[PDB]
Design a protein around this ligand. Structure first.
Ligand SMILES: [Zn+2]
Length: 30
């Protein structure tokens, strides 16, 4: 994990700096 997270809806990875999943739009914290 090089400073990133995975969405809890589409399972897509995203930068730690990000705020919400750019694919489904939903936040990593729902
Ligand atoms: Zn997502």
């Amino acid at each position: 994990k090089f400073e990133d997270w995975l969405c809890n809806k589409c399972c897509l990875n995203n930068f730690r700096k990000r705020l919400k999943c750019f694919r489904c739009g939903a936040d990593k914290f729902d």
